[PDB]
Design a protein around this nucleic acid. Structure first.
Ligand SMILES: [K+]
Ligand SMILES: [K+]
Ligand SMILES: [K+]
Ligand SMILES: [K+]
Ligand SMILES: [K+]
Ligand SMILES: [K+]
Ligand SMILES: [K+]
Ligand SMILES: [K+]
Ligand SMILES: [K+]
Ligand SMILES: [K+]
Ligand SMILES: [K+]
Ligand SMILES: [K+]
Ligand SMILES: [K+]
Ligand SMILES: [K+]
Ligand SMILES: [K+]
Ligand SMILES: [K+]
Ligand SMILES: [K+]
Ligand SMILES: [K+]
Ligand SMILES: [K+]
Ligand SMILES: [K+]
Ligand SMILES: [K+]
Ligand SMILES: [K+]
Ligand SMILES: [K+]
Ligand SMILES: [K+]
Ligand SMILES: [K+]
Ligand SMILES: [K+]
Ligand SMILES: [K+]
Ligand SMILES: [K+]
Ligand SMILES: [K+]
Ligand SMILES: [K+]
Ligand SMILES: [K+]
Ligand SMILES: [K+]
Ligand SMILES: [K+]
Ligand SMILES: [K+]
Ligand SMILES: [K+]
Ligand SMILES: [K+]
Ligand SMILES: [K+]
Ligand SMILES: [K+]
Ligand SMILES: [K+]
Ligand SMILES: [K+]
Ligand SMILES: [K+]
Ligand SMILES: [K+]
Ligand SMILES: [K+]
Ligand SMILES: [K+]
Ligand SMILES: [K+]
Ligand SMILES: [K+]
Ligand SMILES: [K+]
Ligand SMILES: [K+]
Ligand SMILES: [K+]
Ligand SMILES: [K+]
Ligand SMILES: [K+]
Ligand SMILES: [K+]
Ligand SMILES: [K+]
Ligand SMILES: [K+]
Ligand SMILES: [K+]
Ligand SMILES: [K+]
Ligand SMILES: [K+]
Ligand SMILES: [K+]
Ligand SMILES: [K+]
Ligand SMILES: [K+]
Ligand SMILES: [K+]
Ligand SMILES: [K+]
Ligand SMILES: [K+]
Ligand SMILES: [K+]
Ligand SMILES: [K+]
Ligand SMILES: [K+]
Ligand SMILES: [K+]
Ligand SMILES: [K+]
Ligand SMILES: [K+]
Ligand SMILES: [K+]
Ligand SMILES: [K+]
Ligand SMILES: [K+]
Ligand SMILES: [K+]
Ligand SMILES: [K+]
Ligand SMILES: [K+]
Ligand SMILES: [K+]
Ligand SMILES: [K+]
Ligand SMILES: [K+]
Ligand SMILES: [K+]
Ligand SMILES: [K+]
Ligand SMILES: [K+]
Ligand SMILES: [K+]
Ligand SMILES: [K+]
Ligand SMILES: [K+]
Ligand SMILES: [K+]
Ligand SMILES: [K+]
Ligand SMILES: [K+]
Ligand SMILES: [K+]
Ligand SMILES: [K+]
Ligand SMILES: [K+]
Ligand SMILES: [K+]
Ligand SMILES: [K+]
Ligand SMILES: [K+]
Ligand SMILES: [K+]
Ligand SMILES: [K+]
Ligand SMILES: [K+]
Ligand SMILES: [K+]
Ligand SMILES: [K+]
Ligand SMILES: [K+]
Ligand SMILES: [K+]
Ligand SMILES: [K+]
Ligand SMILES: [K+]
Ligand SMILES: [K+]
Ligand SMILES: [K+]
Ligand SMILES: [K+]
Ligand SMILES: [K+]
Ligand SMILES: [K+]
Ligand SMILES: [K+]
Ligand SMILES: [K+]
Ligand SMILES: [K+]
Ligand SMILES: [Mg+2]
Ligand SMILES: [Mg+2]
Ligand SMILES: [Mg+2]
Ligand SMILES: [Mg+2]
Ligand SMILES: [Mg+2]
Ligand SMILES: [Mg+2]
Ligand SMILES: [Mg+2]
Ligand SMILES: [Mg+2]
Ligand SMILES: [Mg+2]
Ligand SMILES: [Mg+2]
Ligand SMILES: [Mg+2]
Lengths: 142, 79, 24, 129, 91, 97, 152
RNA sequence: GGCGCUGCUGCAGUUGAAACGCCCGUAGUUGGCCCCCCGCCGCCACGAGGAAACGGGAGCGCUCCAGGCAGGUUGGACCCGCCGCGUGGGACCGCGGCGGGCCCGGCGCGCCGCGGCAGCCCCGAGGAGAGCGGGCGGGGGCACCGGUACCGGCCGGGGACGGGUGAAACAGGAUGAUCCCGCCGAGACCGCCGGCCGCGCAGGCGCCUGCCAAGACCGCCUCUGUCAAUCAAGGGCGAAGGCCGGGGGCUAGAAGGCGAUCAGACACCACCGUAUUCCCGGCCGUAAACGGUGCCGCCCCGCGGCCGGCGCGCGUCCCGCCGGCCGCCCAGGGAAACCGGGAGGCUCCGGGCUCUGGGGGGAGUAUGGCCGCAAGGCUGAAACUUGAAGGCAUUG
């Protein structure tokens, strides 16, 4: 029947499934551990670091713009990442040595939109949420 | 016409292949022969492919032909 | 390229790498 | 090589009916096919059949009356507890009101309604409706 | 238990003389050490005594043959052709 | 590239390999069951001079010798010289000579 | 038939009468047909040909109908059975013949192909007879040993 | 979870990703029909025995409720551990000399025929193997052998150009070419006939004569008695090119050389030419090795053609049967092109077995291993990157 059958083939019906699961990119991506290694966050929702430089990023082929980002040095493992600073005007609140908190764009570490090479974003600067900081709910000291 | 497949026609069933009749049967049979030089009649296979003789004769009265067999100059019957 | 000739190119490259590793 | 003489019988019959034949010949026969045609008959989906003899595996001649949407076998004969019959009913039969799953049990070849009337289990053979 | 993997009887040479020569000698020396069937004796007892000289150790015939095998292919073909040419000279 | 012909462009039925023939126009190698083949029979003098030859012969009852030559071409040469034409999708199924 | 080791798919075979009884012309008795069977067995005719001989010269289509047993069982009953069974003997014989042809022809790969097929059938049949106890538990086919076993 | 994009239920494999180049073959998986009322497994039911809590579930107005076990003679019932143990079934699925008396409660162990038992064989598959007869065929191996042509040489005749191309130019020629005719040498090749012909496991297969063993099909009231199907590992074969060692060397001809063309032309076209093309002994193991379609088995509206064997008929024909190769085609199938001897009998899904795929790239690459003289082959990732790639079809 293009599949094996018969009452005494359970071992083969299990061997086939075990071998063919790895041909799915999602099962392999979530069960092989090489991504758990290559992941800058080491499998967490967020991580902190200090800002090392402010940069601008030229948008991808259809659009045209200069998005805003920061080069971040992670505290927990001493790695280099880039984080897109959202929400118009916020790039002023990111000084040259700040403790920033970094989370994702979604899509489990895939680029989003037209911003090339960035898979992370900053959500807190110096203990303050950047949403409220934009929305004038809290203010950085001086 | 309204034919029942469980009581078919013998003449049309015989035209068929022998394994594909309703009740499988043989094709061969047996037949009597009369000798030129002696009186008695002997019984022979319809598809003989081994030598067959004439009780006195040291000559052969049968020839293989791949199917039904021939006989060197005798005079036959069917029974 | 025509895949035939990409294949000929790749074979020459692998031959070059193998000669290179053979030293040391 | 041939494995399921009953599978081949049922396919032959459904082809013949789909054309619109009055009879059909299936070979070989066996005990199980005789049982299965008998259940088909007392449920009232087919007319006469006759088993004709050749000192061998026999032949069967079946009479058809245009009622049989489908008939088939389940290979392998999985084992069934008394409480899985309905999870097979809503899988194989078009409705809960007509159709038949066929079980072999230590108290005969029978359909599902009887297998529950006696609330026993068995191993499934086929289905028809 | 098997004692070498490939060299066979050329293991007597050690690491000397290179691969191609040792490959040729394995074949040659196996052929010249082999026992052959005596075309008279009926038995497989013919051994070489010098380059083209073969003696049956059972029936004691001596025969002239090849350098490293008892028969050669040119001699097989020549003997067949000479036999045919004789037979054609018989009318 | 779906399939264009049921015969795959050749007449090869129940075998693995068939012989090779050279094309007469360009000398390309073509398998025998694919090559385009024709047979011609023609006199060795044109008929516009066959009458003059036949009047000026001496042999009483002499006849003009014929010629029997089988031409075989590849597909390219056949189409280019118009032995065969590219056809409509319907017309491709016609085998009439 | 002709299907185990090629793409044959033929059906030519014999089909025997439904009715099981001797002929109206049968005057022989199990005694005398056994007489003929055993004279032929001594003379050296194999069981597959003994049936041909009594079908043709003696005019009996089936032997069990007249007697009640099968020709090889008659041979066993009166004590004239071969040590090796008949079709295994025929297969070994053909294997010997092809080996001997290859002793002169070294470049005949088609013959070597056929040799493999024949010997695979020989091993499979030897396994059946041996586990079925028609042949010693130590029985084996060896090409090198085979050629002289036929005389015995 | 959506996801039948992991598919036991229940995916896909002609062209979108995907059937191993083929044959043999062990483990594994699977295996026709038959006797019923015995034994041993599997299976089905019902029990026994062991934990609550959780999950269900009977009863109860913490005012309801998430709860809790309360409460007004009471109550907190009952279910739910299991490939083990017990009782019963026995359809399906496997596997398998006797009495009597000596003899005596049994049971063994022997003892005598001591006649009591019908003493002790399903059948012979539109499974398979074996046989006999008959024809059949570019199926295979070894020897031998004809024929023109291409190339080379020699005798003679005759006297100006010959070759080559789209057109030309480099090669050739009064040391007489090109052309005609006779003679000699060598190595390839096997035309027309030659095919919707045929054979082989595939790769493949075409001169004459001889020899050698095979093969499928048909015909058959011959033999046997399931001896089978498919197959990891393992073994054999395998176009062309390529490699090692011997031989041979006509044609053509990778490389190399040279005349043109051109902007360039190191290419296409012309000319010369080495390996190679041929034989013997090995090796290598790949092709759009293609029907882009795995093998065994069943059912299947019809009309034709050719090839092999058989039988009935009239007087070569004609009707049938088995096997093969092909065309067209109702139904049905499908995204369609198309298939239709299946790619049908499938969301109405389950005959058996083996292999392969899971968006496009990176990549058949890196790395390790096995094999190979080498050229390679076989096995074969990850990081990272991307919104599509792709099928069949319509109009321009
Ligand atoms: K499939
Ligand atoms: K599938
Ligand atoms: K499978
Ligand atoms: K099973
Ligand atoms: K799978
Ligand atoms: K007939
Ligand atoms: K028929
Ligand atoms: K017939
Ligand atoms: K027949
Ligand atoms: K007949
Ligand atoms: K016959
Ligand atoms: K390719
Ligand atoms: K390629
Ligand atoms: K290539
Ligand atoms: K395409
Ligand atoms: K083609
Ligand atoms: K054909
Ligand atoms: K052909
Ligand atoms: K051909
Ligand atoms: K043509
Ligand atoms: K062409
Ligand atoms: K086969
Ligand atoms: K068949
Ligand atoms: K074997
Ligand atoms: K013997
Ligand atoms: K899913
Ligand atoms: K689901
Ligand atoms: K499928
Ligand atoms: K394509
Ligand atoms: K691929
Ligand atoms: K394959
Ligand atoms: K594979
Ligand atoms: K295989
Ligand atoms: K096999
Ligand atoms: K096998
Ligand atoms: K097994
Ligand atoms: K299995
Ligand atoms: K099994
Ligand atoms: K099977
Ligand atoms: K059970
Ligand atoms: K039961
Ligand atoms: K407890
Ligand atoms: K148990
Ligand atoms: K029990
Ligand atoms: K029990
Ligand atoms: K022939
Ligand atoms: K032939
Ligand atoms: K011919
Ligand atoms: K031949
Ligand atoms: K040959
Ligand atoms: K030959
Ligand atoms: K000649
Ligand atoms: K010649
Ligand atoms: K011919
Ligand atoms: K022909
Ligand atoms: K021919
Ligand atoms: K042929
Ligand atoms: K032919
Ligand atoms: K033919
Ligand atoms: K032919
Ligand atoms: K087998
Ligand atoms: K196996
Ligand atoms: K196989
Ligand atoms: K294999
Ligand atoms: K293998
Ligand atoms: K090989
Ligand atoms: K090869
Ligand atoms: K090759
Ligand atoms: K080469
Ligand atoms: K040459
Ligand atoms: K080359
Ligand atoms: K170029
Ligand atoms: K070019
Ligand atoms: K040249
Ligand atoms: K070369
Ligand atoms: K050469
Ligand atoms: K070549
Ligand atoms: K050559
Ligand atoms: K090769
Ligand atoms: K391949
Ligand atoms: K391919
Ligand atoms: K093809
Ligand atoms: K396969
Ligand atoms: K014909
Ligand atoms: K014919
Ligand atoms: K034929
Ligand atoms: K014919
Ligand atoms: K014919
Ligand atoms: K015919
Ligand atoms: K037929
Ligand atoms: K047929
Ligand atoms: K055939
Ligand atoms: K066809
Ligand atoms: K066919
Ligand atoms: K199977
Ligand atoms: K396979
Ligand atoms: K595969
Ligand atoms: K594959
Ligand atoms: K694959
Ligand atoms: K798979
Ligand atoms: K490596
Ligand atoms: K090596
Ligand atoms: K080399
Ligand atoms: K190397
Ligand atoms: K290497
Ligand atoms: K596309
Ligand atoms: K594609
Ligand atoms: K494409
Ligand atoms: K379309
Ligand atoms: K489309
Ligand atoms: Mg066939
Ligand atoms: Mg799912
Ligand atoms: Mg040549
Ligand atoms: Mg091999
Ligand atoms: Mg040349
Ligand atoms: Mg040259
Ligand atoms: Mg070569
Ligand atoms: Mg291929
Ligand atoms: Mg044909
Ligand atoms: Mg390696
Ligand atoms: Mg479309």
């Amino acid at each position: 029947m293009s599949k094996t059958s018969g009452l005494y083939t359970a071992r083969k019906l299990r061997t086939v499934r075990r071998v063919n699961r790895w041909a799915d990119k999602k099962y392999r991506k979530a069960h092989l551990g090489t991504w758990l290694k290559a992941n800058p966050l080491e499998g967490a929702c967020m991580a902190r670091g200090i800002v090392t430089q402010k940069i601008g990023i030229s948008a991808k082929q259809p659009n045209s713009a200069v998005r805003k980002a920061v080069r971040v040095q992670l505290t927990k493992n001493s790695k280099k990442i880039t984080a897109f600073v959202p929400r118009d005007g916020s790039i002023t609140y990111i000084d040259n040595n700040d403790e920033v908190l970094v989370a994702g764009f979604g899509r489990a570490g895939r680029a989003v939109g037209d911003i090339p090479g960035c898979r992370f974003k900053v959500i807190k600067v110096a203990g303050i949420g950047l949403l409220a900081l934009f929305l004038r709910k809290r203010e950085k000291r001086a | 016409m309204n034919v029942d497949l469980l009581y078919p026609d013998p003449v049309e069933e015989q035209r068929k292949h022998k394994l594909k009749r309703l009740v499988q049967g043989p094709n061969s049979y047996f037949l009597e022969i009369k000798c030129a030089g002696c009186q008695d009649i002997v019984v022979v296979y319809s598809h003989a492919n081994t030598p067959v003789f004439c009780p006195g004769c040291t000559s052969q009265i049968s020839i293989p032909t791949g199917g039904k067999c021939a006989f060197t100059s005798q005079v036959e019957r069917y029974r | 390229m025509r895949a035939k000739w990409a294949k000929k190119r790749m074979r020459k490259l692998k031959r070059k790498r193998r000669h290179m590793k053979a030293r040391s | 090589v041939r494995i399921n003489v009953l599978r081949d019988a049922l396919k032959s019959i459904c082809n013949a009916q789909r054309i619109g034949k009055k009879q059909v010949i299936v070979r070989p026969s066996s005990k199980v096919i005789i049982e299965f045609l008998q259940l088909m008959q007392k449920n009232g989906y087919i007319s006469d059949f006759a088993v004709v003899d050749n000192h061998r595996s026999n032949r069967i001649v079946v009479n058809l009356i245009g009622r049989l949407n489908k008939a088939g076998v389940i290979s392998p004969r999985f084992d069934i507890p008394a409480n899985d019959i309905e999870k097979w009913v809503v899988n194989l039969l078009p409705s809960r009101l007509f159709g038949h799953i066929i079980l072999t049990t230590s108290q005969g070849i029978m359909d599902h309604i009887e297998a529950q009337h006696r609330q026993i289990g068995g191993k499934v053979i086929g289905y028809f409706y | 238990a098997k004692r070498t993997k490939k060299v066979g009887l050329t293991g007597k040479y050690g690491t000397r003389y290179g691969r191609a020569a040792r490959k040729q000698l394995l074949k040659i020396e196996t052929s010249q050490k082999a026992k052959y069937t005596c075309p008279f004796c009926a038995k497989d007892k013919v051994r070489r005594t010098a380059c083209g000289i073969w003696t049956c150790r059972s029936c004691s015939k001596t025969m002239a043959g090849g350098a490293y095998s008892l028969h050669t292919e040119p001699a097989n073909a020549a003997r067949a052709t000479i036999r045919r040419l004789r037979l054609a000279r018989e009318d | 590239m779906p399939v264009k012909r049921r015969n795959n462009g050749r007449s090869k039925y129940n075998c693995g390999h068939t012989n090779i023939v050279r094309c007469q126009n360009c000398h390309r190698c073509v398998p025998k069951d694919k090559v385009i083949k024709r047979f011609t029979i023609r006199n060795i003098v044109d008929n516009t001079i066959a009458d003059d030859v036949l009047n000026a012969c001496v042999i009483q009852g002499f006849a003009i010798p014929k010629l029997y030559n089988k031409v075989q071409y590849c597909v390219s040469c056949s189409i280019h010289n118009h032995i065969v034409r590219v056809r409509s999708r319907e017309d491709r199924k016609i085998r009439t000579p | 038939m002709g299907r185990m080791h090629s793409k044959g798919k033929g059906i030519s075979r014999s089909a025997i009468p439904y009715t099981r009884a001797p002929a109206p012309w049968n005057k022989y008795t199990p005694e005398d047909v056994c007489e003929q069977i055993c004279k032929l067995a001594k003379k050296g005719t194999p069981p597959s040909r003994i049936g041909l001989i009594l079908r043709d010269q003696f005019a009996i289509g089936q032997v069990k109908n007249v007697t009640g047993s099968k020709i090889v069982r008659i041979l066993k009953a009166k004590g004239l059975a071969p040590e090796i069974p008949e079709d295994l003997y025929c297969m070994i014989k053909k294997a010997v013949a092809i080996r001997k042809h290859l002793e002169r022809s070294r470049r005949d790969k088609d013959s070597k192909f056929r040799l493999i097929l024949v010997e695979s059938r020989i091993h499979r049949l030897a396994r059946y007879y041996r586990q079925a106890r028609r042949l010693p538990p130590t029985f084996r086919y060896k090409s090198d040993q085979a050629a002289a076993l036929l005389a015995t």
